[PDB]
Design a protein around this ligand. Structure first.
Ligand SMILES: *[C]C1=C([C])[C]=C2C(=[C]1)N([C][C]([O])[C]([O])[C]([O])[C]OP([O])(=O)OP([O])(=O)O[C][C]1O[C](N3[C]=NC4=C3N=[C]N=C4[N])[C]([O])[C]1[O])C1=NC(=O)[N]C(=O)C1=N2[C][C]C1=[C][C]=[C][C]=[C]1
Ligand SMILES: *[C]C1=C([C])[C]=C2C(=[C]1)N([C][C]([O])[C]([O])[C]([O])[C]OP([O])(=O)OP([O])(=O)O[C][C]1O[C](N3[C]=NC4=C3N=[C]N=C4[N])[C]([O])[C]1[O])C1=NC(=O)[N]C(=O)C1=N2[C][C]C1=[C][C]=[C][C]=[C]1
Lengths: 499, 494
């Protein structure tokens, strides 16, 4: 029954909020729909894999809140393998490369590729992280899909193909599904194109030893009996003096405040009294999550390293079930594994197959890409289709279709009376990640602390000191990168001379 | 507790389904979230207006199922006033006209307007009503917004402005919000552009005497205590032999079958055991409803008629709160009124104002458009913002954003075990309308009848005889309309 704050959702965001509130002396309850905590992070343990993250996993430089939280919980990180060559597989052929970006040799194509990534970052700088709808050209950009933006910008198919894969990979959605404004915001608030795509010095640099699930599990340990599993919230009543929160299993909780730490659209699973205000009412019907199957194929040995491949593959083409892989071998060098994502429409398409059929398709792909028969001899397989999850709605995160972010964006974390909104979707830095979950959970907690008069207003949003264990190298550009012309720029420069 | 079929939702579709099942001898319960039936139809009665439809209202030729159901319930229709001239207000000026379509005088503009409408209908003929995702170019068209389509097709701003208003009006959504495939399916399955926009001989020909709310009220009368108001469904359990349906007010219902007769996304308000299959699980997060405020301004007299205006206004431009109006005067000629829609982003924008502020803006607009100071003296005002409705999610209906209909469309009315899907969104003819609600309710009911072995498979989908009271005239084109070139065509020919 009675407490100071009910937290709805025991994912990282909700657990981070509950921890903060608990540490400040408030009585908190966490109401979690599932028989486990973690939400879109999930670590499976069995003897065959030891442990494996089937949801969120990667952390890297500039993600200082998750890093600090995890380190306080007694967790260690290790570096994803990127020692050997990366592979870009395109038109049925593999092109090994070192460094973050695949090399482009054709000078026209090179100009086009260079201008695309640069323009994405240029457009990002016009977009406030905390209020993307305030971008000078917010409406124009929001009324376009990423597909239309790619069609305008990319004068080569090669740049368009790669850009498309980049969007599919970052947001598990098709270019034609997502607002251009939203996707440009999303990249910018992760620190730009380089930071979002890099392993070394980027978002995918590291994983946690033992799994990211330990973040939520260990916060549950600290909170003890305050976390209620198999308590899906069905009803929130704010008509009276104390907020009443009812669960499916027929329990009632009474609190001063509520933190909603679930994906925005899953707000739909709750009946509200009084009804939600108009904008939120409609917003929660407008904000789907992407589609992904995360797949891990185990091998006796990390045999790709012997061929001087790190295990990173960037795989273009409709026929490839998986467009992106990372080496998922343990830091001890055992439980050799390739992690791959089945993205967007392919997650829909290939979900129809059996587990064994998908295993076969992935091995046959890896064998081709790696040029190795050994890829055809897996010792184990694990996968997770996030599309089927009633209490996530998909992964990694919520995308915004055209028109939505400018019309409804400002309401995402706007408090509804005594309900405050956490969840990674409401973050301003690495929204979509475990990092953004921590930011949003802790900020929603502090919004409540301020409402109770416990902290000043200027303390709701708190800066995070940089990790000493995972420091960030700055993102640099070259002179040529900055000033080389686009394709139309080159053409104009030919027109001008030849006149 | 126990019955043969629980129907979730007491709108027209749910009521039509429940009536059919009840008439066949089954024990049915209707579980309705609100303290009323009707859903997206709602008839308000007070002494000032007598009655007014604040939701769905219009019916017309080819809508034979709603016409038959309403007639059986003892309802009468009357004709929306279209005797006098229509008005097209563009660039701050009024151009009165007769006929459904506002005239175009610039020659290039004429060719561009003509080709736009004709192209929309041409494209629609390649789209199966029952399976739009089977269109030859389904993906190509689905991966584009209507905004992109309009940008490609319309060589003039004039055609693009009118096309844009047309989209905003039909689906209460912005051209950039909606799939081209879905919008073209939507128009096609209402019989084409002419049928969907026409008053005379179209969707807006008629209203019901006394209100459309009587449809659901009268079926509730027939069903007696079988309709449960203020019973929002929160939980559906299909793990055991009988289906268990739980409500918010803590009641349990047990049945052999369930009909879901709510908007697809409102399926989210229900917790399912076992979880929904993957495609439906995601589909219901992907299918919003549009945004509209329906507004009715009352006047002492239908003064527009004296100026030879019927009350239909087609109003272009950003500054106009309302883009479209119809005369809402009673058939007796009293309770003189103009009905207007505040559409899409304007519903979001203007919702912030007070009721009186919106009244003032509409009156000043109508005074301008009708050219009458009399528009400045309303005697009464009623309005309804559908965006605020927890148990509708918006109006008129569900739209599909780019990519959704091809990926998830085929799952809309696919049964989940013992749950069958009604609601206007699942119809194949006038989906989005009261007509579609009846089609889908009756079809979902008959799917269950067949699951029970009561009827043969070929009887799930039943044709409807044409109304003798509201017969349809065919949609005709002229030789020149068919064969006149587009703007690019004229250029190529040069
Ligand atoms: C899925 C996924 C995958 C596959 C992958 C990935 C991911 C994911 N990511 C993301 C993450 O994970 C996220 O962001 C997080 O986790 C989130 O958090 P939050 O905010 O907390 O949320 P969630 O988890 O979901 O939680 C919630 C909760 O709640 C609950 N509920 C619901 N409903 C309800 C409830 N309760 C009560 N009542 C009601 N009604 C649920 O159950 C839950 O629990 C990520 N991230 C990071 O950071 N990293 C990584 O790695 C990741 N991943 C990926 C991404 C990428 C990769 C590569 C490239 C690019 C990108
Ligand atoms: C809103 C509107 C407006 C403003 C206008 C209009 C309309 C609308 N429309 C449409 C109609 O109305 C529709 O379609 C119908 O109504 C539908 O039906 P249905 O399918 O049945 O559905 P609904 O109604 O929604 O119902 C449902 C129910 O359910 C319930 N719920 C929910 N949830 C739940 C429940 N229950 C239990 N549980 C749970 N959870 C609810 O509450 C309800 O009741 C229309 N239509 C026609 O036909 N006509 C007309 O007029 C109309 N309108 C318009 C359109 C137009 C105009 C002009 C131009 C163009 C177009």
């Amino acid at each position: 029954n009675k407490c100071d704050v009910v937290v709805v959702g025991g994912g990282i965001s909700g657990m981070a909020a509950a921890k903060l509130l608990h540490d400040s002396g408030l009585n908190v309850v966490v109401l979690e729909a599932r028989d486990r905590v973690g939400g879109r992070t999930y670590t499976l343990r069995n003897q065959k894999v030891k442990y494996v993250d089937l949801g969120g996993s990667y952390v890297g430089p500039t993600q200082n809140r998750i890093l600090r939280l995890a380190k306080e919980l007694g967790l260690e990180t290790y570096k994803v393998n990127e020692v050997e060559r990366l592979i870009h597989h395109v038109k049925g052929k593999s092109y090994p490369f070192r460094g973050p970006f695949p090399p482009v040799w054709n000078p026209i194509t090179y100009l086009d590729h260079n201008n695309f990534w640069r323009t994405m970052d240029d457009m990002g700088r016009e977009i406030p992280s905390d209020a993307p709808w305030k971008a000078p050209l917010a409406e124009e950009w929001d009324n376009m899909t990423m597909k239309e933006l790619l069609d305008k910008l990319c004068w080569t198919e090669s740049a368009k193909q790669l850009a498309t894969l980049f969007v599919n990979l970052c947001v598990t959605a098709e270019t034609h599904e997502v607002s251009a404004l939203w996707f440009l915001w999303y990249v910018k608030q992760c620190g730009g194109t380089t930071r979002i795509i890099s392993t070394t010095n980027g978002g995918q640099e590291r994983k946690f030893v033992g799994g990211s699930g330990q973040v939520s599990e260990r916060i549950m340990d600290l909170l003890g009996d305050r976390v209620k599993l198999e308590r899906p919230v069905i009803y929130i009543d704010q008509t009276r003096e104390n907020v009443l929160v009812e669960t499916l299993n027929h329990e009632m909780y009474e609190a001063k405040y509520v933190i909603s730490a679930i994906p925005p659209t899953l707000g739909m699973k709750i009946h509200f009294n009084p009804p939600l205000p108009m904008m939120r009412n409609q917003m929660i019907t407008r904000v789907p999550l992407g589609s992904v199957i995360k797949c891990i194929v185990y091998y006796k040995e990390p045999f790709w390293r012997k061929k001087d491949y790190c295990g990173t593959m960037i795989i273009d083409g409709e026929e490839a079930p998986v467009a992106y892989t990372l080496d998922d071998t343990k830091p001890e060098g055992n439980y050799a594994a390739i992690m791959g994502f089945i993205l967007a429409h392919k997650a829909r398409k290939l979900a129809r197959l059996t587990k064994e059929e998908r295993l076969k398709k992935l091995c046959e792909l890896y064998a081709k890409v790696l040029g190795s028969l050994e890829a055809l001899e897996p010792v184990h397989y694990e996968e997770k289709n996030w599309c089927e999850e009633q209490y996530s709605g998909g992964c990694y995160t919520t995308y915004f279709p055209p028109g939505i972010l400018t019309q409804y964006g400002r309401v995402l974390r706007q408090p509804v009376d005594r309900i405050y909104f956490a969840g990674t979707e409401t973050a301003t830095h690495w929204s979509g990640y475990m990092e953004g979950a921590v930011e949003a959970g802790e900020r929603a907690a502090r919004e409540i602390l301020h409402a109770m008069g416990k902290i000043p207003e200027d303390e709701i949003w708190q800066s995070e000191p940089e990790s000493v264990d995972v420091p960030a190298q700055p993102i640099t550009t070259t002179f040529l990168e900055r000033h080389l012309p686009s394709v139309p720029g080159l053409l104009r420069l030919i027109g001008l001379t030849t006149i």
